[model samples]
Target: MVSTLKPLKIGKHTIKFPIFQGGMGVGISWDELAGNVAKEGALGVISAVGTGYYKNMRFVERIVAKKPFEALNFYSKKALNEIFANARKICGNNPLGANILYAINDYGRVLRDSCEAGANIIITGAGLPTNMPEFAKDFSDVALIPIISSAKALKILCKRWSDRYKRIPDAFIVEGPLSGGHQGFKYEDCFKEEFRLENLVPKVVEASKEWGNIPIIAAGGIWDRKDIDTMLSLGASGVQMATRFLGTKECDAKVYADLLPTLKKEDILLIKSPVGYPARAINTGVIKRIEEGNAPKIACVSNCVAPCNRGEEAKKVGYCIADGLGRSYLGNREEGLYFTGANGYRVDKIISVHELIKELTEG
Candidate 1:
């Protein structure tokens, strides 16, 4: 069963398909999903969030006042090593990537840990990582991919990298506003047509030329075969998809698929994130409580993302994102924050990763 799709190369590694399983956090795209995707020859991305919660909370040393202690708890280097070791057991020596958001606390340490843990490709977003290459430092084999929303953002990144690291991105992921999790655009700009994936991909494609033929991957609202083909046709080297992958058996987040059928089109909403950006997620109990002014107390015990300013922003938003996401990972739909793309409503069934890959390549 050969894929109709083309291979995508990053650094010296060549993936069988020009497709990436976008990283989802808080136990979503962990060893189960990522390792299997890599086994299937596409890029499998492991999310580097809340690593202390990995392996049923095995790596965490302590919990202070009901929250995982700051850096070690949020981004556990030890757990990350084990995650990569387990993922390697599944995929062998095949190409595997880790997605470490630039917004997270100890971003540099996490990036280095991902490299140490055997990540050949490192993808980051959530903020402009002007100094991304700095953390990757001596790891020359690692390919750096930055997520960008527009040409101007790329220009800023390229300029900084050129002046400092004297290198450009190995690849660029142009994620649109419809993407799950924190977005690159302001809330108002998200609805603007010019910021849509369709419009943004081409512009990014053109921008990449100035820095040589860097591969551009399009993400957000891309579902099924036609969407993948359309993005490739729009000058994208590949497509990054998160929502479609959630339906796969390999995805550890069984709770999401179980709750899918019960959802309405209105269940997904763009809400304020403590990360200081608009985020897309399901309207779960956490959101409902916030709407009714009955949300949980503010606590920055996780110190997860920098924009939150030690829970100050979480106070304004009425919920701690770290705790909310962790609740979802634990399958507590009542209190969890379910992050999904705009087209999340369409994922109505559970299937194997093998079956979903067949649809993506054969459909």
Candidate 2:
């Protein structure tokens, strides 16, 4: 069994824990949360989503009516560097990672910027990251990991990566439909028992057999330590958790973290996204406001995501993700949007990162 104390080295990176705290963005897992996780031996990962949404314009390049908003403002390189600096202050030379969405507007630019900013691990999702290693051609030492929902995705990714970069992913994260933010499954597929991680992990692990020795990490609906063991026993190399870690004092958005505790069972709903996937999030005021035709407008500042057709996704979905997540991170309870996994309602209280890790691992 892979214990928390066991260390695994991927490529040029050395992580003390077999587990990784899956990346959450829009101010969910920042330097504080990431630093704490890294300090505890797991690869501390910070989400590269909404790069410009930090400390009231610290990373944002523009100021409109004294309010910071826009994709360009949120995905700024300056903002990303500052985020790395903040994490370094906490990590102090520990292994740190940046999670970038493959669907981002300036995907290559941000990927290169993350490499320049000293990220040792780059975990990407929202689509296949076949060119992940290509994006960091100038920096070959950094580790590349991609998130996939199916065994086919891994097989395709591994083949393409080997043909081009001549290197497979340092690791792989297999997420399920029950996860938060943009999902890889259809809206109706979320309720199917077979689409869960417990069943999905084994398939991907079977497909990874030809890839030499790829580590398969499982995500989605992973609650307590008991779930971790089950995943490991089912041929998983490690586990990736997001919601459970969100309910910690070190969480980037304390208010957002606390929101999960207040949700009811049905409050966690799966909704449609412009990315053509079903997204799971706590039924919050932001989404409810959208249903009522009172959601915020799409400013289209950073112009993130090629699929959005320049804020058209925001227009169809009722709000821009970059803007809404920023609002929530700023602690605007009434106007903010928060995303969580299917077991989001189980969140009760916020604890320190160390305490939470000990509790989960000691079990």
| C-alpha local distance difference test of each model | 0.86, 0.80
For residues 26-129, write the lDDT of model 2, one tens digit per residue.
87888888988988877788887776777766867676643455556767678778778888887888888889998866788888888998899899989988
Off by over 4 Å in 2: 1-5, 65-71
Taking all chains together, each candidate's TM-score versus the true structure is: 0.97, 0.94
- Write model 1 residue lDDT over 134-216, tens digit each, in one string: 88878998999999888899989999999998888899999999898878999899999989899999999998889897999
Global lDDT of model 2: 0.80
TM-score of 1: 0.97
| Model 1, runs deviating above 4 Å | none
Error of 2 at 165 (Å): 1.8
